[PDB]
Write a protein that binds this ligand. Structure first.
Ligand SMILES: *[C@@H]1O[C@H](CO)[C@@H](O[C@@H]2O[C@H](CO)[C@@H](O)[C@H](O)[C@@H]2O)[C@H](O)[C@H]1NC(C)=O
Ligand SMILES: *[C@@H]1O[C@H](CO)[C@@H](O[C@@H]2O[C@H](CO)[C@@H](O)[C@H](O)[C@@H]2O)[C@H](O)[C@H]1NC(C)=O
Ligand SMILES: *[C@@H]1O[C@H](CO)[C@@H](O[C@@H]2O[C@H](CO)[C@@H](O)[C@H](O)[C@@H]2O)[C@H](O)[C@H]1NC(C)=O
Ligand SMILES: *[C@@H]1O[C@H](CO)[C@@H](O[C@@H]2O[C@H](CO)[C@@H](O)[C@H](O)[C@@H]2O)[C@H](O)[C@H]1NC(C)=O
Ligand SMILES: *[C@@H]1O[C@H](CO)[C@@H](O[C@@H]2O[C@H](CO)[C@@H](O)[C@H](O)[C@@H]2O)[C@H](O)[C@H]1NC(C)=O
Ligand SMILES: *[C@@H]1O[C@H](CO)[C@@H](O)[C@H](O)[C@H]1NC(C)=O
Ligand SMILES: *[C@@H]1O[C@H](CO)[C@@H](O)[C@H](O)[C@H]1NC(C)=O
Ligand SMILES: *[C@@H]1O[C@H](CO)[C@@H](O)[C@H](O)[C@H]1NC(C)=O
Ligand SMILES: *[C@@H]1O[C@H](CO)[C@@H](O)[C@H](O)[C@H]1NC(C)=O
Ligand SMILES: *[C@@H]1O[C@H](CO)[C@@H](O)[C@H](O)[C@H]1NC(C)=O
Ligand SMILES: *[C@@H]1O[C@H](CO)[C@@H](O)[C@H](O)[C@H]1NC(C)=O
Ligand SMILES: *[C@@H]1O[C@H](CO)[C@@H](O)[C@H](O)[C@H]1NC(C)=O
Ligand SMILES: *[C@@H]1O[C@H](CO)[C@@H](O)[C@H](O)[C@H]1NC(C)=O
Ligand SMILES: *[C@@H]1O[C@H](CO)[C@@H](O)[C@H](O)[C@H]1NC(C)=O
Ligand SMILES: *[C@@H]1O[C@H](CO)[C@@H](O)[C@H](O)[C@H]1NC(C)=O
Lengths: 177, 182, 338, 343, 48, 48
């Protein structure tokens, strides 16, 4: 770009104009070129800052999803996070998140607690689920029905505050033996 | 000549745009009218002593939405931020600076909140976005036999949960999915 | 947290040379010192689009809330969208929209009333006079409310499941018991003090609305972003009133008053001044966009953590042991309810 | 490379007038004209250029023959058909290899098509050409480049264009070039395999903005659209304030030269039509301004010195003059910025 | 981890035209170019 | 002189570079030539 001078090539300008009139045009060239360079360096600085932010995020993602398991949702891939393998890329990194996603689900029934004998029973882990006829306990992200024993539940209450409590019998392996 | 873009040279001030009647209270000594940024806004008529405003003759931006050239050559034009009845009369009177004139069949008119689309038609269906237009409108290439259509965003498939007092959905099975993050 | 700002798409050619052929020819000597500016501004606009999409488009399926609203005594009408309002917005979002006044909405098509302004033209008409325009956002401020409603429906009828896989329904009482279980309190405690905790939640949701109403400016961050953008734009427009060391400030005056080869120096001075002003404006826009992008990434992580699950990290989702959050849409921002 | 250049170029899918030959209308010349002609062997010899095509302005004649060409920038009188007559002022006779190249593969079916382009920017007449026996129906559709042949500095005035014929015992494809921005695709061998206009189609505008032939699916912001003001109003204050010019030129006792009345004209609008209609002038010479260029100028003060004088003394009255009036009665300063009026 | 940097309050007229009335006058011809700088420096101090 | 960085003044065009044989396809009407970004690259020998 001529930048408002005689020509955009100094080698031509000096071989065409003497110093005491060429210094003005060469100064115009200097100011234009250095303004363009200032624009370039500012844009490069901004791009480098953005890349640094992305690199810090990627470093945290490495040290979290690879060197351990992340409980954060939607951080190491969609769904529940299981593992992650890194892969090198040109001027970047690529992850392989392995995520646990549930599958076919069925309505059964639920009750906040079970009242066996005046006492409300609550599951130590999981919810109280009902086939429709027989109440059961299971895990949360997989259906594994189990018999309601004294081991699966902890008892604390008086069977008159829990709204929606449902009547059923609990079991124990100690009365039998 | 009011209500028409026209070069004006009022008493030495020169500019371009539309002038019309105004309801200012120009004090008798007042001659020029401006605003916060001091842009000449209202001009008193030196030979009539009435008040006229000055308006940007036409300020928008042309954007072209196109599919891949290896797929098709049909294109559609976006006139950003303009009521396109204004360009419709502008196209008719042929005072538009753009020289390329894309066809107007009547069905290719689109009063979008983000401007006017020309060369495309409404489809009141809802498809996932392909090319973002703006104001919740997306264009895409589709078979009727092939043309360019414009439609609203579909935020996703419509689903309703079955919440109840004693209803739980518990997954009886699971799957493993491997995605990618770059 | 702000998520985005208004998208400006200035055109250097006219902003610097108002419909002047000779001025455009003179600017043509400055190389590609315009395509760079336009590319930067369109990149900023696309960045804003991706920020809002990243903040809000976290769930694919748009769930709807069940017709009956009895979540174990929890009162959600203040955050649930109101069908009576034609915009389908919650009462809280109503106050958020009312308490923010945008100088430039953008989606106005204001051409046609600048002539009919009657009074002195507004900032918008002024900007439309000297090569300034605003590109309206892709995601209309209405559909954003629909995304917010879908996210709110997912977190009150299906727990935190819908962000992992299929949306599995669960009543709010045992969802409450589980959010309690994730902190260190047994579910039985909730099942014993459900009425008390529901009254606490209702009182808090009542008090937050009054706190937002009576404050002078608690939405000061979004107001600050809007004011910063408007002030930068107004200064950028005002810069055309500086002679920059030339005879006059008006291109059509200098051109019509002086001969070409002498007015060339003055028009070159005007080019060098106006274009430097535009460059400074573009750089400030770049810095603001970087900061807003960082805030939007933080907001997206906050959404996916606090709203879409329980966050164990202290103080991240509000002060204290975090339980949940509800998202609420705002002009050029989001409002969280930890 | 995909270099983009802005230079006078015939628009793509432009409108071209096609003539026949069995009388040779004088087609106007402005911003160049694209020329093409297909023939079996030859029916066309040359062209003539210039304005008014007579012995008053310099003209051009580029007739070819069997072995050479007869380019000349001369002032030919007329031919109306031994192609020039009445030599008065001819110059710059140019002779080189013949333009017309004709080749046949032992048959007349290989009718050569010849595309010629001429331009006259800053003089420097440029002639572009490419000879090839194309399909021969008419103007082809496949792209073809044009190689400049001669570039010669005529430095004259061209307004009208005409073509010459042959003797004997489907051509004239004429199109007018326009100033447009173009992009040309260059082969790795350097030949232009394709070119795209940048003022024809929205797709052309997009491809031009990114200087690339393949545009991927998406939106592209290309330019700005403007509603050009249909008319232009000029309005100034209602002030008339006619100068006392009327009373300085309707006087009945114009003072003598020895005592020249000097009237100070102030606070008025100097309209010169009241001056033009009041006196059938015989000497309205000016020195610092133009008689025509005065109604659009502002002045601080105006002096009207009026005196009746003889005939030769009118020519005497001028800056830097001498005589019994210019020395003893009224001397005009050499640096005088004004006008004199004699009737 | 750094937490803040030194706060700066550079001034237009005093930096550019040290006590020169003509220089300040010719700076005024540049419009409000530098009020932006003063506001930005106030901002950076505030964010520190 | 080829294969030696040397100050050239070909047809008044000044510069400093290494000249060498090139396999380009200059037209007889072509004189200077250039490269992608506007720098004189391949100047054909006016004599040979
Ligand atoms: C309740 O849950 C029971 C699981 O113990 C299911 O009972 C099964 O019934 C078969 C015969 O019907 C038995 O042979 C088997 O051992 C098991 O007990 C029962 O289907 C289920 N009820 C409903 C309505 O789902
Ligand atoms: C579960 O079974 C309890 C008895 O073991 C029921 O308590 C009864 O409640 C009734 C009133 O509803 C009393 O009249 C009666 O004396 C006894 O206390 C209890 O209601 C029952 N609950 C459900 C949900 O079935
Ligand atoms: C859980 O879902 C798996 C796939 O998502 C099932 O595996 C399938 O098993 C069938 C045969 O049963 C194969 O044909 C198929 O290729 C796939 O491996 C799996 O059976 C299922 N488990 C249950 C208990 O439903
Ligand atoms: C949930 O909370 C709402 C608060 O917005 C209650 O609405 C109230 O309705 C009364 C009139 O019935 C108004 O006077 C009051 O200002 C408020 O709008 C709503 O009733 C409440 N619902 C339940 C089931 O608690
Ligand atoms: C550029 O010019 C080269 C020199 O003729 C071409 O190379 C030739 O290609 C032909 C086949 O077309 C070979 O038979 C010959 O031996 C030589 O390699 C080259 O093709 C050409 N490139 C173009 C026109 O794109
Ligand atoms: C639970 O029951 C509702 C009742 O209509 C049904 O729509 C939903 O699909 C059921 N959920 C299942 C089967 O997982
Ligand atoms: C302007 O001058 C004309 C000429 O006499 C007159 O008819 C008209 O009323 C004037 N108008 C004003 C506003 O002075
Ligand atoms: C723009 O929209 C339509 C179409 O032109 C018309 O009502 C009028 O021109 C404008 N309306 C408003 C409210 O600006
Ligand atoms: C179909 O499209 C038209 C506009 O072309 C619209 O008015 C109408 O409401 C649409 N119908 C449906 C069912 O969406
Ligand atoms: C839940 O129970 C309450 C009262 O116990 C009742 O008002 C409501 O309709 C019930 N909802 C469902 C889905 O059963
Ligand atoms: C060429 O002329 C015909 C007939 O005069 C006209 O219809 C056509 O539009 C012209 N071509 C163009 C490109 O306008
Ligand atoms: C040159 O041409 C003019 C007419 O244009 C003619 O009057 C003049 O005599 C010619 N020159 C000669 C023959 O001296
Ligand atoms: C053609 O023109 C040239 C010009 O030098 C001349 O020598 C030759 O005699 C002319 N005629 C033929 C048939 O070559
Ligand atoms: C004087 O004025 C009258 C009235 O307009 C006009 O008819 C006459 O020609 C004028 N005479 C001179 C000498 O200006
Ligand atoms: C000049 O003109 C005025 C007009 O009123 C007249 O009174 C005066 O006597 C004149 N002077 C001479 C020298 O004639």
């Amino acid at each position: 770009s001529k930048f408002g001078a005689i020509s955009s090539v100094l080698n031509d300008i000096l071989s065409r104009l003497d110093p005491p009139e060429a210094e003005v045009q060469i100064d115009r060239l200097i100011t234009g070129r250095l303004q363009s360079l200032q624009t370039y360096v500012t844009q490069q600085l901004i791009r480098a800052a953005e890349i640094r932010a992305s690199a810090n995020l990627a470093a945290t993602k490495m040290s979290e999803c690879v060197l351990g398991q992340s409980k954060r949702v939607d951080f190491c891939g969609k769904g529940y996070h299981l593992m992650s393998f890194p892969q090198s890329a040109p001027h970047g990194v690529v992850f392989l998140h392995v995520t646990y996603v549930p599958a076919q689900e069925k309505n059964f029934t639920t009750a906040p607690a079970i009242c066996h004998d005046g006492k409300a029973h609550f599951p130590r882990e999981g919810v109280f689920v009902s086939n429709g006829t027989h109440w059961f306990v299971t895990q949360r992200n997989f259906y594994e029905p189990q018999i309601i024993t004294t081991d699966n539940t902890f008892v604390s209450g008086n069977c008159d505050v829990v709204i929606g409590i449902v009547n059923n019998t609990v079991y124990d392996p100690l009365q039998l033996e | 000549v009011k209500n028409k873009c026209v070069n004006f040279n009022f008493n030495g001030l020169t500019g371009t745009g539309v002038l019309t009647k105004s309801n200012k209270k120009f004090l008798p000594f007042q001659q020029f009218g401006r605003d916060i940024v001091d842009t000449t806004d209202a001009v008193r008529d030196p030979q009539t002593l009435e008040i006229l405003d000055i308006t940007p003759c036409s300020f928008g931006g042309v954007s072209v939405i196109t599919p891949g050239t290896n797929t098709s050559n049909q294109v559609a034009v976006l006139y950003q931020g303009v009521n396109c009845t204004e360009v419709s009369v502008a196209i008719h009177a042929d005072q538009l600076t753009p020289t390329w004139r894309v066809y107007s069949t009547g069905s290719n008119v689109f009063q979008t909140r983000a401007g006017c689309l020309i060369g495309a038609e409404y489809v009141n269906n809802s498809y996932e976005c392909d090319i973002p237009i703006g104001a919740g409108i997306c264009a895409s290439y589709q078979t009727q036999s092939q043309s360019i259509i414009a439609y609203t965003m579909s935020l996703g498939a419509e689903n309703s949960v079955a919440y109840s007092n004693n209803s739980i959905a518990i997954p009886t099975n699971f799957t493993i999915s491997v995605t990618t993050e770059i | 947290l702000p998520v985005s700002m208004t998208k400006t798409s200035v055109d250097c050619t006219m902003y610097i040379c108002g419909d002047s052929t000779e001025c455009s020819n003179l600017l043509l000597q400055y190389g590609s010192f315009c395509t760079q500016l336009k590319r930067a501004l369109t990149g900023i606009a696309v960045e804003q689009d991706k920020n809002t999409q990243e903040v809000f488009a976290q769930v694919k399926q748009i769930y709807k809330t069940p017709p009956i609203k009895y979540f174990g005594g929890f009162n959600f009408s203040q955050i649930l969208p109101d069908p009576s309002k034609p915009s389908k917005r919650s009462p809280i979002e109503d106050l958020l929209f009312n308490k923010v006044t945008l100088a430039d909405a953008g989606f106005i098509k204001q051409y046609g009333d600048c002539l009919g302004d009657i009074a002195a033209r507004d900032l918008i008409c002024a900007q439309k006079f000297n090569g300034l325009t605003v590109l309206p956002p892709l995601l209309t401020d209405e559909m954003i409310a629909q995304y917010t409603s879908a996210l709110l429906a997912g977190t009150i009828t299906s727990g935190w499941t819908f962000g992992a896989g299929p949306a599995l329904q669960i009543p709010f009482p045992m969802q409450m018991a589980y959010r309690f279980n994730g902190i260190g309190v047994t579910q039985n405690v909730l099942y014993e003090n459900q009425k008390l905790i529901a009254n606490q939640f209702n009182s808090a949701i009542g008090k937050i609305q009054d706190s937002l109403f009576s404050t002078p400016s608690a939405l000061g961050k979004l107001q600050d972003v809007v004011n910063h953008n408007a002030q930068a734009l107004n200064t950028l427009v005002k810069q055309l009133s500086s002679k920059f060391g030339a005879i006059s400030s008006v291109l059509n005056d200098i051109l019509s008053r002086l001969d070409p080869p002498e007015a060339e120096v003055q028009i070159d001075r005007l080019i060098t001044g106006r274009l430097q002003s535009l460059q400074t404006y573009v750089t400030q826009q770049l810095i603001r966009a970087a900061e807003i992008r960082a805030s939007a990434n933080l907001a997206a992580t906050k959404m996916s953590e606090c709203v879409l699950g329980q966050s164990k990290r202290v103080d991240f989702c509000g002060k204290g042991y975090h339980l949940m959050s509800f998202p609420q849409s705002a002009p050029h921002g989001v409002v969280f309810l930890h | 490379v995909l270099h983009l250049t802005q230079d006078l170029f015939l628009p793509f899918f432009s409108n071209v007038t096609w003539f026949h030959a069995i009388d040779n209308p004088v087609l106007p010349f402005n911003d160049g004209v694209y020329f093409a002609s297909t023939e079996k062997s030859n029916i066309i010899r040359g062209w003539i250029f210039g304005t008014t095509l007579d012995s008053k302005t310099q003209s051009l004649l580029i007739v070819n023959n069997a072995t050479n060409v007869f380019i000349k920038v001369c002032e030919f009188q007329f031919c109306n058909d031994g192609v020039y007559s009445s030599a008065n002022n001819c110059t710059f006779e140019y002779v080189s290899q013949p333009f017309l190249m004709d080749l046949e593969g032992k048959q007349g079916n290989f009718k050569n098509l010849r595309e010629f382009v001429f331009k006259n920017i800053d003089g420097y007449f440029k002639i572009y050409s490419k000879h090839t026996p194309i399909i021969g129906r008419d103007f082809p559709q496949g792209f073809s480049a044009l190689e400049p042949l001669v570039d010669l500095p005529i430095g004259i005035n061209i307004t009208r264009f005409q073509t010459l014929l042959a003797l004997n015992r489907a051509d004239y494809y004429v199109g007018y070039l326009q100033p447009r921005t173009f992009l040309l695709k260059y082969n790795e061998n350097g030949t232009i395999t394709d070119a795209v206009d940048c003022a024809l189609d929205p797709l052309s505008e997009t491809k031009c903005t990114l200087k690339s032939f393949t545009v991927e699916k998406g939106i592209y912001q290309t330019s700005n659209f403007r509603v050009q003001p249909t008319e232009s109003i000029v309005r100034f204050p209602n002030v008339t304030n006619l100068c006392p010019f009327h009373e300085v030129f309707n006087a009945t006792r114009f003072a003598s030269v020895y005592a020249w009345n000097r009237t100070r004209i102030s606070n008025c609008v100097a309209d010169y039509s009241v001056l033009y209609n009041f006196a059938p002038f015989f000497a309205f010479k000016c020195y610092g301004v133009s008689p025509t260029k005065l109604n659009d100028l502002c002045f601080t003060n105006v002096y009207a010195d009026s005196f009746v004088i003889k005939g030769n003394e009118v020519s005497q009255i001028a800056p830097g003059q001498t005589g019994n009036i210019a020395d003893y009665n009224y001397k005009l300063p050499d640096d005088f910025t004004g006008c004199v009026i004699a009737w």
